[PDB]
């Protein structure tokens, strides 16, 4: 056995796992499929103009305790993501402003929207974060889509449309392909849509100067860059009572334990001898990744903030996106970032690169004025077609799975253990979760030695 533990996957999670295992004294190796240490945290510090740019995850939540601790211990510094000003909703094509995310109460759709929002949170409490599958209403919830739930519950077409962008954007899927139990679970495990949907707090409250991929790179540096083997895609995993043997084509390694720290979908692209037990097998084969676009437009000044707008925006139909200010104090170019997912992604991916850009810029203009009409820099990053991430921002599940194999997300199969954000108890789908899943996997393994 070449080493104690081999961590497959060099994301925040795999990396956090290796730091932990390493600090505890175990011999460790991190085997990574492509040629970069970031996870779905992808950073180019000198790449683009204006400042460092993140193509993946970048927001640190106010309660993302493990991420903050780890980042800090690595010497990284945080800066507030929030911006002062009114938030913006583009509903039915009309521009609405909301002082402290407080829409005019007289707007016809507002009260039922609030009401439905409270409904969602209540449903999120009926099923929990720890054992959604064991919840009393698990069977009924996991048997229908979020789409059918919106149709049966809500009156206002506009409320329905708000919920849909929200789901299309937090997951990279549309309510028409997501299990209701699964979403109730998600809202529950990320502390409610209120935090899930924050604009200046909750999940979206801070950034790392320098880029999110740093926590990873820094770990590698701290742990011994030589320990991270890039371009080493694991394709077969032979595991017995003694340990595990990884194969990358002809090459191979041997360890006492392994932690596969990637999405279920991603892990499902690896052969396991012996075959994985059937619940984990189903879980991996049936838990897809979202369909997502991360657009970025930089300008010489924060004209949106300068005009009293926070840059935070929600649009139900022009494009189908959540906008957010992404300007660091340090940057030399103001930047607005937008996220398009699910069916909204489907929509645009069908258009041409330029059509997309035009449409996006048009929107920015409708919301913030003609200055948006012409950016200093524009970038789009299609996650649904990234080779190793294979999609959206997070994992999602169709009706029929979470309630039948959910536990497979966490339970180890012999000597192989599972990390990756999807295995976190809470904040699964976020870097925080990634960090937590990694550390818990590490501890489990530590204890086995
Ligand atoms: C556009 C976008 C925006 C996001 N924004 C945020 C945000 O603001 N805040 C937040 O908290 N989260 C955000 N996220 C999610 C966050 O990035 C992820 O939750 C987190 O990075 C997942 O980490 P991970 O370590 O579990 O997995 P990953 O980051 O997916 O890393 C898994 C690693 O495994 C490697 N791998 C895959 N297959 C193999 C194989 N066969 N052999 C070897 N290695 C393999 C991969 O290449 C990769 O490096 C966002 C995601 C996207 C796509």
Where does ligand 1 bind, in terms of residues with CB under 6 Å? 8-14, 31-34, 39-41, 56-59, 233-234, 261-263, 266, 269-270, 292, 294, 383, 388-389, 393, 420-421, 429-432, 434
| Method in brief | X-ray
Percent helix, strand and coil across the chain, each rounded to 5?
A: 40, 20, 40
Residue having the nearest C-alpha atom to atom 52 of ligand 1:
393
Using alpha carbons only, give the angle 198, 204, 208 rounded to the nearest 5 degrees: 165
**Residue 301 near residue 372, CB atoms below 8 Å:** no
Resolution (A): 2.9
User: Which CATH number applies to 106-197?
Assistant: 1.10.405.10
Q: What is the Cα–Cα distance from 310 to 303, expressed in whole angstroms? A: 10
With residue 255 as reference, give the H or E element that holds it. strand 251-260
From residue 236, alpha-carbon distances to 205, 218, 233, 245, 272 in Å are 40, 29, 9, 8, 6
The first and second tokens of residue 408, run together, are 């497979």
SS3 sequence of 315-326: ECCCCCEEEEEC
DSSP assignment letter at 360: H
Using alpha carbons only, give the angle 81, 12, 213 rounded to the nearest 5 degrees: 55
Calculate the CA 111 to chain-centre distance: 30
Q: What is the domain class of 1-39+62-77+209-289+395-449 according to CATH?
A: alpha beta
The residues spanned by each domain of the chain are: 1-39+62-77+209-289+395-449, 40-61+78-105+198-208+290-394, 106-197
Q: What is the Cα–Cα distance from 417 to 374, expressed in whole angstroms? A: 49
Q: What is the Cα–Cα distance from 90 to 107, expressed in whole angstroms? A: 13
Q: What is the Cα–Cα distance from 398 to 418, expressed in whole angstroms? A: 21
Whole-number Å distance, alpha carbon 187 to ligand 1 midpoint, is 20
User: Which CATH number applies to 40-61+78-105+198-208+290-394?
Assistant: 3.90.660.10
**Residue 41 near residue 12, CB atoms below 8 Å:** yes
**Residue 23 near residue 31, CB atoms below 8 Å:** no
With residue 297 as reference, give the H or E element that holds it. strand 292-299
Q: What is the Cα–Cα distance from 429 to 221, expressed in whole angstroms? A: 26
Residue having the nearest C-alpha atom to atom 19 of ligand 1:
430
Q: What is the Cα–Cα distance from 26 to 5, expressed in whole angstroms? A: 7
Please report the atom of ligand 1 found closest to the CA of residue 235: 41
Pocket test for ligand 1, best of 11, 53, 341 (most atoms within 8 A of CB): 11
Q: What is the Cα–Cα distance from 339 to 446, expressed in whole angstroms? A: 39
Residue 202, Ramachandran bin (φ over 0: left; ψ between -120 and 50: alpha; else beta)? left
């Amino acid at each position: 056995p070449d080493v104690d533990v081999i961590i497959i996957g060099a994301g925040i999670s795999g990396s956090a796992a290796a730091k932990a295992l390493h600090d505890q004294g175990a011999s460790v190796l991190v085997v990574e499929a492509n040629d970069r240490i970031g996870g779905r945290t992808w950073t180019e510090q000198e790449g683009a103009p204006g400042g460092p740019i993140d193509y993946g995850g970048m927001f640190i939540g106010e309660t993302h305790t493990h991420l903050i601790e780890l980042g800090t211990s690595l010497g990284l510094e945080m800066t507030p993501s929030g911006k002062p000003g009114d938030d913006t909703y583009i509903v039915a094509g009309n521009v609405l402003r909301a002082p402290d995310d407080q829409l005019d109460p007289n707007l016809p759709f507002v009260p039922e929207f609030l009401s439905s929002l409270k409904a969602l949170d209540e449903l999120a409490d009926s099923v929990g974060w720890d054992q959604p599958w064991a919840s009393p209403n698990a069977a009924a919830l996991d048997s229908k889509t979020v789409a059918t739930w919106l149709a049966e519950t809500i009156e206002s077409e506009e409320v329905r449309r708000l919920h849909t962008v929200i789901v299309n954007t937090l997951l990279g899927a549309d309510p028409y392909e997501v299990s209701l139990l699964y979403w109730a679970y998600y809202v529950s495990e990320c502390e409610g849509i209120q935090s899930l949907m924050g604009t200046r707090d909750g999940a979206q409250w801070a950034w790392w100067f320098g880029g999110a991929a740093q926590v990873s790179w820094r770990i590698a540096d701290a742990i011994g860059r030589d320990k991270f083997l890039l371009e080493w895609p694991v394709d077969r995993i032979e595991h017995d009572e003694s340990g595990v043997t990884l194969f990358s084509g002809q090459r191979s390694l041997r360890a006492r334990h392994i932690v596969i720290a990637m999405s279920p979908l991603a892990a499902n692209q690896i052969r396991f001898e012996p075959a994985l037990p059937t619940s984990r097998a189903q879980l991996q084969a049936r838990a897809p990744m979202g369909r997502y676009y991360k657009v970025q437009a930089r300008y010489p000044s924060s004209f949106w903030v300068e005009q009293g707008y926070s840059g935070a925006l929600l649009d139900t139909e022009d494009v189908g996106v959540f906008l957010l200010d992404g300007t660091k104090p340090t940057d030399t170019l103001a930047t607005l970032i937008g996220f398009i997912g699910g069916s909204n992604y489907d929509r645009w991916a069908a258009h041409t690169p330029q059509e997309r850009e035009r449409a996006f810029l048009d929107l920015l203009v409708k919301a913030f004025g003609p200055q948006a009409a012409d950016p200093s820099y524009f970038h789009e990053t299609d996650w649904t077609q990234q080779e190793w991430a294979k999609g959206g921002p997070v994992t999602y599940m169709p009706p029929g799975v979470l309630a039948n194999f959910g536990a497979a997300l966490r339970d180890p199969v012999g000597k192989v253990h599972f990390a990756g954000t999807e295995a976190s108890f809470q904040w699964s789908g976020y870097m925080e979760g990634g960090v937590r899943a990694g550390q818990k996997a590490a501890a489990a393994i530590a204890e086995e030695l």
